[PDB]
């Protein structure tokens, strides 16, 4: 059915770590963070035991706490390691579902390690060219 | 369109000239007769000859026609 | 009494039909039962290749076809008779093989 809410108009436009709007399902809401997609957002909401039918504003302190804990501690809530971005690390060989800005920081770390050793992928990154071997004769005028 | 070529027309002319009493005004009987008379090597050509012959016969009944 | 099977294939329809009627006649001088002939659907080996020996001109293609026809007849007869029934029918263009 429909909830007949009053005195609790959920329009909390500031939310978890990124200015997530509170007028959309929580599933696609978590995607607004830099590091979470629809798949990961759905799984984190499932493990958080939060129903996927209420807008983000409906959520409260305990739900947000749980969402944070899952997002930053995936190897604690029965999340398979094959489900996380940034798997076995080039530092300690561990699993790290990197969320916001430290994601871009890890990206810059990858760029720095490539450019430091003067690798073809790093060199093409430095020039600003496609590194995955795509043709650039004609389909690169954008 | 369906314009009859010269082979079928000359075949029908010689059928009428050489077997007039036997030929009739019926397409099926004409078929079975042209099977016996000529040695066409195709069912379609035999049918076209026989049918155009039937049409010629059905014209000849209303007076002589010049050419036969 | 055995379960001798005769299966024969060719590219020419008329020669195959003549040789099949020949084996029927040969088994009819005796009194071998004739379960067939049974007619397998014909195989059409299709090759589509470009006419030009190079790469110039309008795009035209040739559709070459080889047609294969297979037939089976089941004969219940003593093992002696089917040997002659088959080896006296060596009509060209038809490859015949015998299996129990």
């Amino acid at each position: 059915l429909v909830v007949q809410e009053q005195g609790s108009f959920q329009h909390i436009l500031r939310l978890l770590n990124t200015n997530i709007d509170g007028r959309i399902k929580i599933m696609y809401a978590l995607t607004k963070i830099r590091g979470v997609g629809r798949r990961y957002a759905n799984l984190v909401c499932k493990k958080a035991d939060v129903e996927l039918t209420k807008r983000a504003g409906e959520l409260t302190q305990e739900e947000l706490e749980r969402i944070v804990t899952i997002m930053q501690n995936p190897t604690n809530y029965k999340i398979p390691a094959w489900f996380l971005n940034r798997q076995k690390d080039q530092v300690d060989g561990k699993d790290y579902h990197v969320l916001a800005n430290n994601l871009e920081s890890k990206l810059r770390d990858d760029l720095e390690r490539l450019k430091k050793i003067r690798s073809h992928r790093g060199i093409r990154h430095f020039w600003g060219l496609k590194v995955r071997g795509q043709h650039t004769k004609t389909t690169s005028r954008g | 369109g369906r314009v009859r070529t010269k082979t079928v027309k000359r075949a029908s002319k010689v059928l009428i000239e050489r077997f007039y009493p036997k030929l009739t005004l019926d397409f099926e009987t004409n078929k079975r007769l042209t099977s016996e008379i000529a040695v066409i090597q195709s069912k379609r050509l035999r049918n076209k000859i026989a049918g155009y012959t039937t049409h010629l016969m059905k014209r000849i009944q209303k007076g002589p026609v010049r050419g036969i | 009494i055995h379960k001798i099977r005769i299966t024969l294939t060719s590219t020419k329809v008329k020669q195959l039909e003549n040789v099949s009627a020949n084996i029927i006649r040969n088994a009819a001088q005796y009194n071998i039962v004739k379960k067939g002939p049974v007619r397998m659907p014909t195989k059409v080996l299709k090759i589509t290749t470009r006419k030009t020996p190079n790469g110039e001109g309008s795009k035209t293609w040739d559709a070459y076809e080889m047609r294969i026809h297979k037939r089976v007849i089941d004969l219940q007869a003593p093992a002696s008779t089917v040997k002659r029934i088959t080896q006296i029918t060596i009509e060209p263009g038809v490859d015949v093989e015998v299996t129990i």
Binding site: - | - | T48, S58, K59, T60, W61
Partner: protein, 141 residues
């Protein structure tokens, strides 16, 4: 054998073979009632061999169909055409030729497909063009 007829019915490549033997008013599609097969819309095309003539032609006959081929719409059209053919053939060899003449007059006054099968085939695809008639795009200079 007590009282049976065997008729078919076709469309694009969909083929329906009917088995109309003496029965109790049972009209089935591959073992399922006329009231549903897959769809919800086109049921009335196979209702037509019934509503045009009434249900009473099927009082003592039981019909079975083994439609195979084509697609959903093709199968539906083949099935209803085969039902019409089977009913007509039953009235021919068992019930009444005058009855079948009246029935086929109803069908032909409604739809010639019910008795006359559609003789349309996909025209072959020709080289130099994706379809039978469609051509590859031409680039002058």
């Amino acid at each position: 054998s007590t009282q049976s007829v065997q008729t078919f019915g076709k469309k694009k490549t969909a083929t329906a073979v009917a088995h109309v033997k003496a029965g109790k008013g049972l009209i089935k599609i591959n073992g399922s009632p006329i009231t549903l097969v897959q769809p919800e819309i086109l049921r009335f095309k196979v209702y037509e061999p019934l509503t045009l003539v009434g249900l009473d032609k099927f009082q003592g006959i039981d019909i079975r169909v083994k439609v195979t081929g084509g697609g959903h719409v093709s199968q539906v059209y083949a099935i209803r055409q085969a039902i019409a053919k089977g009913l007509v053939a039953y009235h021919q060899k068992y019930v009444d030729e005058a009855s079948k003449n009246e029935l086929k007059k109803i069908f032909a006054s409604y739809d010639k497909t019910l008795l006359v099968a559609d003789s349309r085939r996909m025209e072959p695809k020709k080289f130099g063009g994706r379809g039978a008639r469609a051509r590859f795009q031409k680039s002058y200079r």
